[PDB]
């Protein structure tokens, strides 16, 4: 293996999108990893709807919680909105 990787705890930027019942994020510096907002997967229905409405299409900062470099997956948690949004 080889390639650039973020470290757990790192706060990085990307654009949020929805897919397969959850919120994911297109990480600007890690475009080839499927990055999911871990907290959105099992979030209770009504709050999930609000969460999706608040974040989809927005540019945000997220904190890295887990990196699977062999399979290409990254789990993150939404932190804050960007200046570009």
Swiss-Prot record:
Keywords: Host-virus interaction, Inhibition of host innate immune response by virus, Inhibition of host interferon signaling pathway by virus, Inhibition of host PKR by virus, Interferon antiviral system evasion, RNA-binding, Viral immunoevasion. Residues 5-79 form the S1 motif domain. The record marks 42 as: Involved in host species specificity. GO terms for biological process: symbiont-mediated suppression of host innate immune response; symbiont-mediated suppression of host PKR/eIFalpha signaling; symbiont-mediated suppression of host type I interferon-mediated signaling pathway. Residues 40-50, 71-76 are annotated as: Binding to host EIF2AK2/PKR. InterPro entries: K3-like_poxvir, NA-bd_OB-fold, S1_domain. Changing residue 73 to A: Complete loss of inhibition of host EIF2AK2/PKR kinase. It comes from the Viruses. GO terms for molecular function: peptidase inhibitor activity; protein sequestering activity; protein serine/threonine kinase inhibitor activity; RNA binding. One of its GO terms (cellular component) is cytoplasm. Coiled coil: none annotated. Pfam families: S1. Viral mimic of EIF2S1/eIF-2alpha that acts as a pseudosubstrate for EIF2AK2/PKR kinase. Inhibits therefore EIF2S1/eIF-2alpha phosphorylation by host EIF2AK2/PKR kinase and prevents protein synthesis shutoff. Determinant of host species specificity. Belongs to the poxviridae K3 protein family. The C-terminus is involved in the inhibition of host EIF2AK2/PKR kinase. Interacts with host EIF2AK2/PKR kinase. This is Protein K3.
């Amino acid at each position: 293996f080889c390639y650039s990787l973020p470290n757990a705890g790192d706060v990085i930027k990307g654009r949020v999108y929805e897919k397969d019942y959850a919120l994911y994020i297109y990480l600007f510096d890690y475009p080839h990893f499927e990055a999911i907002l871990a907290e959105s997967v099992k979030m209770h229905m009504d709050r999930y709807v609000e969460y999706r409405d608040k974040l989809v299409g927005k540019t945000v900062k997220v904190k890295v919680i887990r990196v699977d470099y062999t399979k290409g997956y990254i789990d993150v948690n939404y932190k804050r909105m960007c200046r570009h949004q």
